[PDB]
Design goal:
Elements (H helix, E strand, L loop, with lengths): L27 H13 L3 H18 L4 H9 L15 H12 L3 H11 L2 H7 L15 H12 L6 H14 L5 H10 L8 H14 L19 H21 L3 H11 L4 H4 L13 E3 L3 H7 L5 E6 L3 E7 L5 E4 L11 H10 L7 E11 L4 E2 L2 H4 L15 E12 L2 E2 L5 H11 L7 E3 L2 E2 L4 H13 L4 E6 L15 E5 L10 E10 L8 E10 L4 E8 L5 H11 L3 E2 L6 E2 L8 E3 L4 E5 L2 E5 L14 E5 L2 E5 L11 H9 L6
Parallel strand pairs: 1-12, 7-9, 15-17
Antiparallel strand pairs: 2-10, 2-11, 3-4, 3-5, 5-6, 5-7, 7-8, 11-12, 13-14, 13-18, 13-19, 14-15, 16-18, 19-22, 20-21
The structure holds adenosine monophosphate.
It binds three DNA strands through helix 4, helix 10, helix 16, strand 15 and strand 20.
DNA sequence: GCTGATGCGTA
DNA sequence: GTCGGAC
DNA sequence: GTCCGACTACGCATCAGC
């Protein structure tokens, strides 16, 4: 009985402790009970083993259901390069809950905001749907198929057809299924277990219970013959095999069939990096100063590069001439850049047959020959576009080469990857140039280079080692680069003091308290408080709780007449304007919804804050002494990318 | 035909 | 994108 | 440091309502 399924017990037997016979469709309640055990605990090692116990039963009993269970665990619809999206958020989901329960739409919405979780609302609610015959139980493969049916619905009356499928899943839900069905559609499973733990559990499962055995499986625990140390070392080595293969081929549709046929030890023989298949990109960790760079990169030689304010473009050139461009989320952006594809012959030497370039697509003004801000880049059409209709030109800033002429450069150091990039590729001003770099260890040269990058319309500096731990192996370390921005440096930057005028009820980890706040600057001329941005990060859990304690005494039934928010989200609790906080941000943007400093730089648009975070409470200041809207306008114009 | 709410994907 | 929490 | 899930602004694409 899947209701009593306990994949977190001691001495879990993949065959006998399961809740379905061999060859049967894996019941979705087995996935739901697994999700229950995972969210109860907080140690990743316990979560991985609990999920591994489920996958071992799937491997031993119903191998065809391995893929949908893995996707349901990740809450994904398929490979990222296929661009499958549900099209369902909280708006559609809360409507499907109301129709399924006969409740008012706002009653469900208010309860969802109060409880901070939509899945809890769908669970305690009472179904108003009557069925002539009791529905069959949900299966993991059937539920996963319905999700892809919802994602496949487009056109007129799509919402009603999506809602019907969601309501069809709810009438067949048993026990905790409705809770996790709603969370999946809401996109907030709240497991504490994501892509890294799903892979860790997959490699542990296929290692302890090897696939491809005749039933019943002869080897059910391949680690019982090993010591605790030998078992740990072996499982860790098996985990790296899967992690590095998935880092180069993040496609479960390609790995899982190979895995069930040739095992994990022979997986690299059948799944290899190749152009046309997106790869996991290299990420960066923040650095709070030039001194910390030399500390993290002690002894090792590194290079400083401009950090361009654009969108990452992973450009693949296949053997044959086909070109594909992927985002850093492995989304296919080929149709977005007809101009880049036209430019490919201009960037490579005639000996270059195939490559994978790591570049930054930046909006480029061809009349003035200068970089344009990130907001200009986002105005480009996203769907299939034609090159003749392009209005915002892009310039590619290449900084790495991952693949060259049938050979992978993943395990080559950056010094060689960079050398191969600049030997085989041709620069063109305003179209394809190599990222501005500086090889140095001097603190004053790095400081001057950081100031020069901001003056040259860039966010700051990227710092990468050249020879020591300088490979492109994401499984070794996904954040092996360093980023140095001015807003990271203590004292070297501008911060704003804004008034808290509203609060937003928190979700998930913030459930039961405030998850966000609405901030405002003081407009001197109109003597009003103008909403500038929302704030929801920068404070500790202890600080957030004290914010929730004191601000509850400031809850107003209706807003004060001198508070202007315009198009901003109406706060859940209006707050009497009293608390003033210091806020840090990366940039100031021209906002389509916030009224702060409207008319001071633009007649229609106001100003907002890019990447805002809470620093400290300013008990010394009252709302009259907050940062003025005129000062907000001054800070916006002092930016290099702005007139 | 237009607009606004919703969803998604970039940072 | 930033951030803190649990490990 | 790793992994994870809270949270930010904003613009295109989509679709329901007018
Ligand atoms: P995130 O804040 O993790 O930073 C990494 C992204 O920065 C962009 N980027 C701009 N310029 C560079 C250079 N020179 N090297 C590497 N990355 C750069 C990329 O789009 C990254 O996604």
């Amino acid at each position: 009985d899947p209701s009593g399924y306990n994949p977190a017990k001691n001495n879990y037997h993949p065959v006998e402790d399961a809740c379905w016979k061999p060859g049967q469709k894996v019941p979705y309640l087995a996935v739901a009970r697994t999700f229950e055990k995972i969210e109860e605990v907080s140690a990743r090692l316990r979560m991985v083993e609990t999920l591994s116990n489920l996958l071992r039963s799937v491997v031993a009993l119903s191998p065809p259901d391995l893929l949908p269970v893995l996707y349901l665990s990740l809450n994904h619809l398929g490979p990222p390069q296929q661009g499958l999206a549900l099209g369902v958020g909280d708006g559609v989901l809360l409507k499907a809950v109301a129709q399924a329960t006969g409740r008012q739409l706002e009653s469900v919405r208010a309860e969802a905001a109060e409880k901070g979780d939509v899945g809890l609302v769908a669970e305690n609610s009472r179904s108003t749907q009557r069925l002539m015959l009791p529905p069959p139980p949900l299966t993991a493969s059937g539920v996963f198929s319905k999700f892809r049916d919802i994602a496949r619905l487009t056109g007129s009356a799509s919402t009603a057809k999506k809602i019907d499928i969601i309501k069809g899943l709810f009438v067949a839900c048993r026990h905790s299924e409705a809770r996790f069905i709603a969370r999946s559609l809401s996109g907030r499973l709240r497991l504490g277990l994501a892509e890294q733990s799903v892979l860790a559990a997959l490699s542990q499962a296929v290692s302890l219970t090897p696939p491809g055995q005749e039933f019943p499986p002869a080897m059910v625990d391949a680690g019982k013959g090993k010591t605790a140390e030998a078992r740990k070392t072996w499982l860790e080595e098996q985990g790296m095999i899967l992690k590095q293969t998935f880092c180069e081929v993040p496609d479960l549709d390609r790995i899982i069939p190979v895995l069930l046929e040739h095992g994990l030890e022979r997986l690299p023989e059948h799944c290899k990096l190749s152009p046309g298949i997106p790869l996991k990109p290299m990420l960066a960790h923040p650095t709070r100063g030039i001194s910390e760079v030399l500390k993290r990169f002690e002894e090792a030689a590194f290079t400083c590069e401009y950090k361009y304010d654009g969108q990452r473009a992973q450009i693949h050139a296949l053997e044959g001439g086909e070109v594909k461009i992927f985002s850093r989320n492995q989304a296919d952006n080929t149709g977005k850049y007809p101009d880049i594809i036209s430019r490919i012959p201009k960037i490579k030497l005639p000996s270059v047959t195939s490559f994978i370039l790591d570049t930054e697509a930046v909006a480029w003004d061809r009349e003035k020959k200068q970089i344009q801000p990130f907001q200009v880049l986002t105005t480009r059409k996203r769907k299939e576009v034609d090159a003749s209709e392009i209005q915002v030109q892009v310039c590619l800033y290449a900084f790495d080469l991952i693949y060259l002429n049938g050979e992978s450069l993943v395990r080559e150091p950056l010094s060689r990857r960079r050398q191969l990039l600049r030997e085989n590729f041709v620069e063109t001003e305003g179209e394809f140039v190599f990222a501005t770099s500086l090889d140095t260890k001097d603190i004053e040269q790095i400081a001057e280079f950081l100031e020069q990058s901001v003056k040259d319309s860039c966010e700051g500096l990227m710092v990468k080692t050249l020879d020591v731990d300088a490979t492109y192996e994401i499984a070794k370390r996904s954040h092996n680069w360093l980023k140095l921005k001015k807003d990271y440096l203590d004292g070297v930057g501008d911060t704003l003091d804004l008034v808290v005028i509203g609060a937003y009820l928190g979700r998930g980890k913030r459930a039961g308290r405030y998850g966000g706040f609405l901030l405002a600057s003081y407009d001197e001329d109109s003597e009003e408080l103008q909403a500038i941005c929302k704030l929801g990060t920068g404070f500790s859990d202890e600080e957030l709780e004290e914010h929730h304690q004191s601000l509850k005494a400031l809850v107003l039934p209706s807003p004060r007449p001198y508070v202007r928010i315009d198009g901003a989200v109406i706060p859940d609790h209006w707050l009497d304007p009293s608390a003033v906080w210091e806020v840090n941000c990366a940039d100031l943007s021209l906002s389509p919804i916030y009224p702060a400093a409207r008319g001071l730089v633009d007649s229609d648009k106001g100003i907002s804050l890019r990447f805002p975070r809470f620093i400290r409470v300013r008990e010394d200041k009252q709302p009259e002494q907050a940062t003025t809207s005129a000062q907000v306008a001054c800070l916006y114009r002092k930016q290099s990318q702005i007139q």
